[PDB]
PDB file of C-alpha atoms and ligand atoms in Angstrom:
ATOM      1  CA  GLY A   1      89.775 113.569 117.302  1.00  0.00           C
ATOM      2  CA  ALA A   2      93.023 114.035 115.270  1.00  0.00           C
ATOM      3  CA  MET A   3      95.294 117.044 116.202  1.00  0.00           C
ATOM      4  CA  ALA A   4      95.277 118.335 112.576  1.00  0.00           C
ATOM      5  CA  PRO A   5      92.560 116.335 110.778  1.00  0.00           C
ATOM      6  CA  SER A   6      93.887 115.282 107.286  1.00  0.00           C
ATOM      7  CA  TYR A   7      93.058 113.250 104.151  1.00  0.00           C
ATOM      8  CA  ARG A   8      95.599 110.757 102.727  1.00  0.00           C
ATOM      9  CA  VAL A   9      95.442 108.076 100.022  1.00  0.00           C
ATOM     10  CA  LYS A  10      97.303 104.742  99.954  1.00  0.00           C
ATOM     11  CA  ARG A  11      97.463 102.098  97.205  1.00  0.00           C
ATOM     12  CA  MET A  12      97.252  98.895  99.295  1.00  0.00           C
ATOM     13  CA  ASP A  13      94.859  96.262 100.712  1.00  0.00           C
ATOM     14  CA  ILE A  14      92.374  97.997 103.128  1.00  0.00           C
ATOM     15  CA  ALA A  15      92.490  94.709 105.151  1.00  0.00           C
ATOM     16  CA  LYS A  16      96.085  95.815 106.152  1.00  0.00           C
ATOM     17  CA  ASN A  17      95.106  99.424 107.198  1.00  0.00           C
ATOM     18  CA  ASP A  18      96.863 101.301 110.073  1.00  0.00           C
ATOM     19  CA  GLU A  19      93.669 103.122 111.261  1.00  0.00           C
ATOM     20  CA  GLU A  20      91.395 102.755 114.345  1.00  0.00           C
ATOM     21  CA  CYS A  21      88.429 101.455 112.233  1.00  0.00           C
ATOM     22  CA  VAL A  22      87.546 100.323 108.660  1.00  0.00           C
ATOM     23  CA  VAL A  23      84.649 101.050 106.291  1.00  0.00           C
ATOM     24  CA  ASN A  24      83.511  97.970 104.309  1.00  0.00           C
ATOM     25  CA  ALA A  25      82.040  98.432 100.775  1.00  0.00           C
ATOM     26  CA  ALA A  26      79.309  96.007 101.843  1.00  0.00           C
ATOM     27  CA  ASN A  27      76.348  94.383 100.076  1.00  0.00           C
ATOM     28  CA  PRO A  28      72.889  94.752 101.629  1.00  0.00           C
ATOM     29  CA  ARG A  29      72.609  91.033 102.704  1.00  0.00           C
ATOM     30  CA  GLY A  30      75.849  90.869 104.735  1.00  0.00           C
ATOM     31  CA  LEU A  31      77.300  88.278 102.268  1.00  0.00           C
ATOM     32  CA  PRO A  32      81.083  87.814 101.799  1.00  0.00           C
ATOM     33  CA  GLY A  33      80.831  89.469  98.324  1.00  0.00           C
ATOM     34  CA  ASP A  34      83.790  90.505  96.055  1.00  0.00           C
ATOM     35  CA  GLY A  35      86.741  92.995  96.082  1.00  0.00           C
ATOM     36  CA  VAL A  36      86.963  95.123  99.295  1.00  0.00           C
ATOM     37  CA  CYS A  37      84.040  93.169 100.849  1.00  0.00           C
ATOM     38  CA  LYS A  38      85.760  89.745 100.353  1.00  0.00           C
ATOM     39  CA  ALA A  39      89.073  91.103 101.838  1.00  0.00           C
ATOM     40  CA  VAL A  40      87.131  92.476 104.870  1.00  0.00           C
ATOM     41  CA  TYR A  41      85.287  89.097 105.244  1.00  0.00           C
ATOM     42  CA  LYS A  42      88.655  87.212 105.278  1.00  0.00           C
ATOM     43  CA  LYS A  43      90.254  89.619 107.863  1.00  0.00           C
ATOM     44  CA  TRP A  44      87.207  90.339 110.170  1.00  0.00           C
ATOM     45  CA  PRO A  45      84.653  87.525 109.550  1.00  0.00           C
ATOM     46  CA  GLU A  46      83.184  88.033 113.097  1.00  0.00           C
ATOM     47  CA  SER A  47      82.041  91.539 111.935  1.00  0.00           C
ATOM     48  CA  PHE A  48      79.470  89.934 109.525  1.00  0.00           C
ATOM     49  CA  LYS A  49      77.151  88.847 112.392  1.00  0.00           C
ATOM     50  CA  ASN A  50      73.829  90.683 111.628  1.00  0.00           C
ATOM     51  CA  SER A  51      75.684  93.116 109.264  1.00  0.00           C
ATOM     52  CA  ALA A  52      72.792  93.128 106.676  1.00  0.00           C
ATOM     53  CA  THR A  53      71.515  96.736 106.138  1.00  0.00           C
ATOM     54  CA  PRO A  54      69.638  98.605 103.348  1.00  0.00           C
ATOM     55  CA  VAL A  55      71.185 100.553 100.442  1.00  0.00           C
ATOM     56  CA  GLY A  56      72.285 104.072 101.510  1.00  0.00           C
ATOM     57  CA  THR A  57      72.953 103.036 105.187  1.00  0.00           C
ATOM     58  CA  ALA A  58      75.903 102.054 107.403  1.00  0.00           C
ATOM     59  CA  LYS A  59      75.865  99.498 110.253  1.00  0.00           C
ATOM     60  CA  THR A  60      78.858  98.997 112.599  1.00  0.00           C
ATOM     61  CA  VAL A  61      79.757  95.528 113.968  1.00  0.00           C
ATOM     62  CA  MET A  62      82.787  95.021 116.284  1.00  0.00           C
ATOM     63  CA  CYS A  63      85.481  92.380 115.522  1.00  0.00           C
ATOM     64  CA  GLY A  64      86.819  92.135 119.124  1.00  0.00           C
ATOM     65  CA  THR A  65      87.190  95.885 119.850  1.00  0.00           C
ATOM     66  CA  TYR A  66      87.986  96.826 116.217  1.00  0.00           C
ATOM     67  CA  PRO A  67      84.953  98.518 114.520  1.00  0.00           C
ATOM     68  CA  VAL A  68      83.878  97.536 110.952  1.00  0.00           C
ATOM     69  CA  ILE A  69      81.401 100.087 109.459  1.00  0.00           C
ATOM     70  CA  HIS A  70      79.397  98.205 106.757  1.00  0.00           C
ATOM     71  CA  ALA A  71      78.426 100.940 104.241  1.00  0.00           C
ATOM     72  CA  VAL A  72      76.037  99.892 101.414  1.00  0.00           C
ATOM     73  CA  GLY A  73      76.485 101.914  98.224  1.00  0.00           C
ATOM     74  CA  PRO A  74      73.983 101.497  95.350  1.00  0.00           C
ATOM     75  CA  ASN A  75      74.597  99.058  92.430  1.00  0.00           C
ATOM     76  CA  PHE A  76      74.332 101.480  89.445  1.00  0.00           C
ATOM     77  CA  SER A  77      73.277  98.436  87.282  1.00  0.00           C
ATOM     78  CA  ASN A  78      69.915  98.551  89.208  1.00  0.00           C
ATOM     79  CA  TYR A  79      69.547 102.261  90.141  1.00  0.00           C
ATOM     80  CA  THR A  80      68.971 105.248  87.802  1.00  0.00           C
ATOM     81  CA  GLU A  81      71.926 107.734  87.738  1.00  0.00           C
ATOM     82  CA  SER A  82      69.707 110.176  89.749  1.00  0.00           C
ATOM     83  CA  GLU A  83      68.557 107.731  92.487  1.00  0.00           C
ATOM     84  CA  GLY A  84      71.985 106.045  92.651  1.00  0.00           C
ATOM     85  CA  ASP A  85      73.660 109.443  93.166  1.00  0.00           C
ATOM     86  CA  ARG A  86      71.215 110.125  96.109  1.00  0.00           C
ATOM     87  CA  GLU A  87      71.872 106.695  97.805  1.00  0.00           C
ATOM     88  CA  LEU A  88      75.685 107.026  97.303  1.00  0.00           C
ATOM     89  CA  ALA A  89      75.677 110.459  99.077  1.00  0.00           C
ATOM     90  CA  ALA A  90      73.486 108.990 101.862  1.00  0.00           C
ATOM     91  CA  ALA A  91      75.777 105.957 102.518  1.00  0.00           C
ATOM     92  CA  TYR A  92      78.740 108.364 103.114  1.00  0.00           C
ATOM     93  CA  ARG A  93      76.632 110.654 105.425  1.00  0.00           C
ATOM     94  CA  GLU A  94      75.827 107.496 107.504  1.00  0.00           C
ATOM     95  CA  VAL A  95      79.609 106.644 107.599  1.00  0.00           C
ATOM     96  CA  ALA A  96      80.321 110.180 109.039  1.00  0.00           C
ATOM     97  CA  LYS A  97      77.668 109.637 111.805  1.00  0.00           C
ATOM     98  CA  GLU A  98      79.207 106.232 112.763  1.00  0.00           C
ATOM     99  CA  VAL A  99      82.840 107.520 112.758  1.00  0.00           C
ATOM    100  CA  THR A 100      81.714 110.432 115.023  1.00  0.00           C
ATOM    101  CA  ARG A 101      79.695 108.116 117.355  1.00  0.00           C
ATOM    102  CA  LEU A 102      82.674 105.699 117.754  1.00  0.00           C
ATOM    103  CA  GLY A 103      85.007 108.630 118.783  1.00  0.00           C
ATOM    104  CA  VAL A 104      87.899 107.190 116.620  1.00  0.00           C
ATOM    105  CA  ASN A 105      90.842 109.445 115.643  1.00  0.00           C
ATOM    106  CA  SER A 106      91.283 107.697 112.244  1.00  0.00           C
ATOM    107  CA  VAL A 107      89.283 105.675 109.637  1.00  0.00           C
ATOM    108  CA  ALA A 108      90.282 103.584 106.535  1.00  0.00           C
ATOM    109  CA  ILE A 109      87.681 104.081 103.709  1.00  0.00           C
ATOM    110  CA  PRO A 110      87.322 102.700 100.130  1.00  0.00           C
ATOM    111  CA  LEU A 111      85.510 104.574  97.285  1.00  0.00           C
ATOM    112  CA  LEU A 112      81.912 103.175  97.441  1.00  0.00           C
ATOM    113  CA  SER A 113      80.178 102.088  94.190  1.00  0.00           C
ATOM    114  CA  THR A 114      83.440 102.353  92.055  1.00  0.00           C
ATOM    115  CA  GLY A 115      83.953  98.553  91.535  1.00  0.00           C
ATOM    116  CA  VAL A 116      81.320  95.926  90.506  1.00  0.00           C
ATOM    117  CA  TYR A 117      78.555  98.382  91.630  1.00  0.00           C
ATOM    118  CA  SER A 118      79.835 101.105  89.177  1.00  0.00           C
ATOM    119  CA  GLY A 119      77.526  99.831  86.341  1.00  0.00           C
ATOM    120  CA  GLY A 120      80.668  99.926  84.074  1.00  0.00           C
ATOM    121  CA  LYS A 121      81.358 103.716  84.595  1.00  0.00           C
ATOM    122  CA  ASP A 122      84.420 105.520  86.102  1.00  0.00           C
ATOM    123  CA  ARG A 123      82.896 107.012  89.303  1.00  0.00           C
ATOM    124  CA  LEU A 124      86.177 108.156  91.019  1.00  0.00           C
ATOM    125  CA  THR A 125      85.187 111.876  91.061  1.00  0.00           C
ATOM    126  CA  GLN A 126      81.492 111.227  91.902  1.00  0.00           C
ATOM    127  CA  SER A 127      82.287 108.863  94.817  1.00  0.00           C
ATOM    128  CA  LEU A 128      85.294 110.886  96.193  1.00  0.00           C
ATOM    129  CA  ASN A 129      83.255 114.149  96.188  1.00  0.00           C
ATOM    130  CA  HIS A 130      80.422 112.475  98.195  1.00  0.00           C
ATOM    131  CA  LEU A 131      83.128 111.124 100.607  1.00  0.00           C
ATOM    132  CA  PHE A 132      84.439 114.733 101.100  1.00  0.00           C
ATOM    133  CA  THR A 133      80.904 116.245 101.553  1.00  0.00           C
ATOM    134  CA  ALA A 134      80.246 113.716 104.382  1.00  0.00           C
ATOM    135  CA  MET A 135      83.665 113.574 106.073  1.00  0.00           C
ATOM    136  CA  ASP A 136      84.720 117.290 105.863  1.00  0.00           C
ATOM    137  CA  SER A 137      82.836 118.132 109.136  1.00  0.00           C
ATOM    138  CA  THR A 138      84.477 115.180 111.031  1.00  0.00           C
ATOM    139  CA  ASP A 139      87.851 115.522 112.848  1.00  0.00           C
ATOM    140  CA  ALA A 140      89.097 111.939 112.144  1.00  0.00           C
ATOM    141  CA  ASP A 141      92.243 111.362 110.016  1.00  0.00           C
ATOM    142  CA  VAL A 142      90.727 109.811 106.815  1.00  0.00           C
ATOM    143  CA  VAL A 143      92.906 107.368 104.806  1.00  0.00           C
ATOM    144  CA  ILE A 144      91.418 106.368 101.407  1.00  0.00           C
ATOM    145  CA  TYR A 145      92.504 102.909 100.091  1.00  0.00           C
ATOM    146  CA  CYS A 146      92.649 102.179  96.307  1.00  0.00           C
ATOM    147  CA  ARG A 147      94.194  99.446  94.048  1.00  0.00           C
ATOM    148  CA  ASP A 148      94.853 101.278  90.718  1.00  0.00           C
ATOM    149  CA  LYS A 149      98.081 103.337  90.225  1.00  0.00           C
ATOM    150  CA  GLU A 150      96.282 105.995  88.089  1.00  0.00           C
ATOM    151  CA  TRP A 151      93.441 106.282  90.693  1.00  0.00           C
ATOM    152  CA  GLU A 152      96.108 106.844  93.485  1.00  0.00           C
ATOM    153  CA  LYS A 153      97.503 109.845  91.481  1.00  0.00           C
ATOM    154  CA  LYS A 154      93.963 111.286  90.761  1.00  0.00           C
ATOM    155  CA  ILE A 155      92.827 110.915  94.450  1.00  0.00           C
ATOM    156  CA  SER A 156      96.150 112.439  95.685  1.00  0.00           C
ATOM    157  CA  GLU A 157      95.759 115.428  93.279  1.00  0.00           C
ATOM    158  CA  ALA A 158      92.080 116.004  94.360  1.00  0.00           C
ATOM    159  CA  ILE A 159      93.198 116.006  98.059  1.00  0.00           C
ATOM    160  CA  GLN A 160      96.158 118.404  97.348  1.00  0.00           C
ATOM    161  CA  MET A 161      93.894 120.844  95.335  1.00  0.00           C
ATOM    162  CA  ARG A 162      91.849 121.653  98.527  1.00  0.00           C
ATOM    163  CA  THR A 163      95.411 122.273  99.975  1.00  0.00           C
TER     164      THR A 163
HETATM  165  N1  LIG B   1      98.090  97.171  95.746  1.00  0.00           N
HETATM  166  C1  LIG B   1      96.957  96.629  96.207  1.00  0.00           C
HETATM  167  N2  LIG B   1      95.966  97.505  96.592  1.00  0.00           N
HETATM  168  C2  LIG B   1      94.817  97.005  97.073  1.00  0.00           C
HETATM  169  C3  LIG B   1      94.563  95.674  97.219  1.00  0.00           C
HETATM  170  C4  LIG B   1      95.549  94.728  96.845  1.00  0.00           C
HETATM  171  C5  LIG B   1      95.355  93.335  97.014  1.00  0.00           C
HETATM  172  C6  LIG B   1      96.340  92.451  96.682  1.00  0.00           C
HETATM  173  C7  LIG B   1      97.547  92.898  96.161  1.00  0.00           C
HETATM  174  C8  LIG B   1      97.775  94.230  95.974  1.00  0.00           C
HETATM  175  C9  LIG B   1      96.788  95.196  96.315  1.00  0.00           C
HETATM  176  N1  LIG B   2      91.293  94.872  99.177  1.00  0.00           N
HETATM  177  C1  LIG B   2      91.184  96.065  98.569  1.00  0.00           C
HETATM  178  N2  LIG B   2      91.601  97.159  99.280  1.00  0.00           N
HETATM  179  C2  LIG B   2      91.481  98.374  98.723  1.00  0.00           C
HETATM  180  C3  LIG B   2      90.947  98.601  97.493  1.00  0.00           C
HETATM  181  C4  LIG B   2      90.507  97.507  96.712  1.00  0.00           C
HETATM  182  C5  LIG B   2      89.969  97.679  95.416  1.00  0.00           C
HETATM  183  C6  LIG B   2      89.607  96.598  94.667  1.00  0.00           C
HETATM  184  C7  LIG B   2      89.750  95.313  95.164  1.00  0.00           C
HETATM  185  C8  LIG B   2      90.241  95.101  96.416  1.00  0.00           C
HETATM  186  C9  LIG B   2      90.635  96.191  97.237  1.00  0.00           C
HETATM  187 CL1  LIG B   3      98.969  95.431  99.070  1.00  0.00          CL
HETATM  188 CL1  LIG B   4      81.672  98.404  94.386  1.00  0.00          CL
HETATM  189 CL1  LIG B   5      91.030 101.398  92.626  1.00  0.00          CL
END
């Protein structure tokens, strides 16, 4: 694992990450999708072979030797706040298992269910806190990728607050 495991945030395309593996904000059917998922499909299309997996799970498919961890967050348009919150926590716990199994020293990760699956709500804090609950026990360097300038500041602050 990393010598001093850290969290960092960068405002850039996750398809251009500098980490040993990537988490996709996938859909359950392994379709090219939108946003993060479409950028991952363009960069690592080979990783979508048998990538379909249920809501609240993660499935890893290799693009050459580069791992892509397909994590399926809930679409809060379809789920109740209560059940959606449970599936969103579960998807991140499955990401932590896969990162540990792969023995990577670093992982690039988006905030699950904060885009078209947000059901029109700001879910920065909800999603980021479930990311921390899952990843805190792992020793990989975690690099969170976002698009919005205000989200970059809020994620950076939330990381710094824990020290
Ligand atoms: N700044 C930034 N962050 C994430 C994705 C992007 C895609 C294309 C241009 C800029 C982007
Ligand atoms: N490509 C990409 N990378 C990071 C964050 C994103 C957010 C929204 C759209 C695309 C993104
Ligand atoms: Cl960019
Ligand atoms: Cl989303
Ligand atoms: Cl964003």
